[PDB]
């Protein structure tokens, strides 16, 4: 698909399969409700890059409570609007270019030891983003 490879160490945007914590695909089984995004493979500590050109809209945290991975952002532009979780970003507002450094992946293995480390990416309307990867 159209998006840039998001994770510094990767040829493409590969998706988390199934590990001891769960599975990474859109609508994957979760406890209250299905998985609302897609988990894109990425090594803890890695540089993450913008999937598309647009504007960082704001900080957007994945969780209501503090943990080692509780940061992220919303980005919109070029027909796309995503929330990207488990990243410490460079900035919480302003312009960003496709493939530009967006931030660093936070300590996935500290929070979920044995997970396939990933960025969780979600369309802003919670629709399936898989086609764009």
What does residue 130 show for φ and ψ, rounded to 5 degrees? Answer: -55, -35
What does residue 132 show for φ and ψ, rounded to 5 degrees? Answer: -85, -20
Under the binding rule (CB under 8 A), the answer on residue 45 touching a second copy is: yes
Selected from 77, 96, 116, 120, the binder of Zn ion by CB under 5 A is: 120
Quick one: 25 or 116, whose CB is closer to a second copy? 116
Under the binding rule (CB under 8 A), the answer on residue 113 touching a second copy is: yes
Site track for a second copy across 60-89, x = CB under 8 A: --------x---------------------
What does residue 54 show for φ and ψ, rounded to 5 degrees? Answer: 175, -155
DSSP state string for 28-94: ---SSS---SEEEE--TT-EEE-SSSEEEEEE--S-SS--TT--EEEEEETTEEEEEESEEES-SSE
Q: Which does 70 bind (CB under 5 to 8 A by kind): a second copy, Zn ion, none?
A: none
Give residues in contact with Zn ion (CB under 5 A): 39, 120
Give residues in contact with a second copy (CB under 8 A): 8-11, 20, 43-47, 68, 107-110, 113-117
């Amino acid at each position: 698909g159209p998006w840039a490879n998001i994770c510094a160490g990767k040829s493409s945007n590969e998706i988390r399969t199934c590990d001891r914590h769960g599975c990474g695909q859109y609508s994957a089984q979760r406890s209250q409700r299905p998985h609302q995004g897609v988990d894109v493979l990425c090594s803890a500590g890695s540089t993450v890059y913008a999937p598309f050109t647009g504007m960082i809209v704001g900080q957007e945290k994945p969780y209501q409570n503090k943990n080692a991975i509780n940061n992220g952002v919303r980005i919109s532009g070029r027909g796309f609007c995503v929330k990207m979780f488990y990243i410490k970003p460079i900035k919480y507002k302003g312009p960003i270019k496709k493939g530009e450094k967006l931030g660093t992946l936070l300590p996935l293995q500290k929070v979920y030891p044995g997970i396939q480390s990933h960025v969780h990416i979600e369309n802003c309307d919670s629709s399936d983003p898989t086609a764009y990867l």
